[PDB]
């Protein structure tokens, strides 16, 4: 009496509406369709940027943070515009829940490509269920101040826990300019979306 | 006289037939199925690199560009092969429409994963058009001919809108070779994908 | 007798029940729901990073490495961990298949982000079903080691197909510290995902 069109199918066998997925891609989750590998976003809200302070220093900048979960990587962007000229080394730390991957920084937000906040648990995030990480390294950076350069140096990034929270570090070395700088670095997450 | 496999269920309560779904990975738009984050590609065609020019200068590149959408963040990418070896800044500018996000520059195309062009209005590269915002940065790159390491320096991106249309506008330093590089940044679009 | 809820429509005029679904999201492919811009890693697996040699010097490297498709795009990353203070320049070379992209040189596999293993052959990550490809380039890099700040240097990479398979080739230009470094670069493949 009724027809289904591909990709819903219809078994006269059993009466039966299905439908068809290609499982690479899709699958089932308690009954719900949904991604093998979703990408899940975990940001600084839309031009609403985290205060950071440099250690004890009276010395802060302005961060846009974006964490982009493809499969199980993370890819981690920051965009650093600090206020203050400074030469040596600035500590920018950033706490994250040991349990939920929550940020305690500052705000952050899982968003949708809508703009939609997503009610969704940022473990994603999280290196490990364990507390177990090594991830450590340097990225080159060019600090620079209204359109002009400034300096070609180099920002180093950690990842470890503390007093059971995780960490992402990062020590920029800047010889006179503001710390202004973008970088970016991938790690892995062994926690699985399910 | 029929039954629904999960992830179609059957509510005897209003005889109606729904898709369960994860809210955070799918949802309904416009009465269709769609992602709550889905991969948008804006880029130069295959093998079809644009043809970009120094300002006034007689000094030209071709350039692979792509620009990656996700949640509601853009990766930026761009591949520059410039013709001729220069000493200075050259100035590689991208004017794109301010309301519909289509490239005036030169020609490029929303590509999915499938290698097929889709039909969709570029919107979702265009970031805040508030004048007082002035997205920019520096990025370190590597200038280099035939496999051959020429220079360490730095490339500057700066979005901006102006006359009605979204630039990004790219500054390149060289020091006696042609402008030859990759660089990658990251921004965020006001425009989300409903 | 039965109601559909979006995104399930029931079309009176031909008594069929369809799915809804936006085209540029979402596709049908051999009667199965996909996703018209998947995201599929192909990587090293979880703390088995793969063994490289420099050639045939007695020189090798521990390197984690992630091939992250979106759209028609791979955006290539690798975390590399010398042994040897390198004298000169290193090269580490990636073999993969050239039909099945398998990689040859050590163990990948295609991961969700379920943390589980998938079922598809690899062949995402090549350049062309042609066996053809031009891509060269070069990133500037910092070497470190334990946290401490070594060298900012330069790596090159190139794609290649050698006797029907495909390369990417890095050269790591130290002067006589370890090659402790991440890298990352973005290249094209013409290769849809159907």
């Known amino acids: ?50 205060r950071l302070r440099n250690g ?41 829940d040991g349990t939920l991957g929550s940020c305690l920084t500052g705000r952050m937000q899982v968003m949708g490509g809508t703009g939609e906040e997503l009610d969704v648990t940022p473990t994603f995030i999280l290196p490990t269920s364990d507390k177990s990480v090594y991830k450590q390294g340097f990225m080159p950076i060019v600090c620079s101040e209204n359109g002009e350069f400034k300096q ?12 059971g929270n995780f960490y992402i570090t990062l020590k920029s070395t800047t010889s006179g300019c503001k710390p202004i700088f973008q970088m970016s670095f991938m790690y892995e997450s062994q926690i699985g979306i399910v």
Not at 57 to 86: C, K, P, S, W
């Open 56 to 96: 004890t220093y009276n010395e802060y900048a302005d961060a846009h943070i974006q964490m982009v979960r493809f499969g199980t990587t993370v890819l981690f962007n920051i965009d650093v515009t600090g206020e203050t000229n400074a030469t040596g080394t600035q500590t920018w730390e950033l706490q994250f």
């Open 152 to 163: 070609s140096t180099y920002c180093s990034y950690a990842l470890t826990y503390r007093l």
């Open 1 to 50: 009496s009724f027809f289904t069109a591909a990709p819903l199918s219809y078994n006269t066998g059993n009466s039966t509406i299905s439908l068809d997925y290609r499982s690479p891609q899709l699958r089932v989750s308690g009954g719900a369709l949904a991604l093998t590998s979703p990408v899940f976003v975990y940001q600084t809200p839309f031009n609403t940027p985290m």
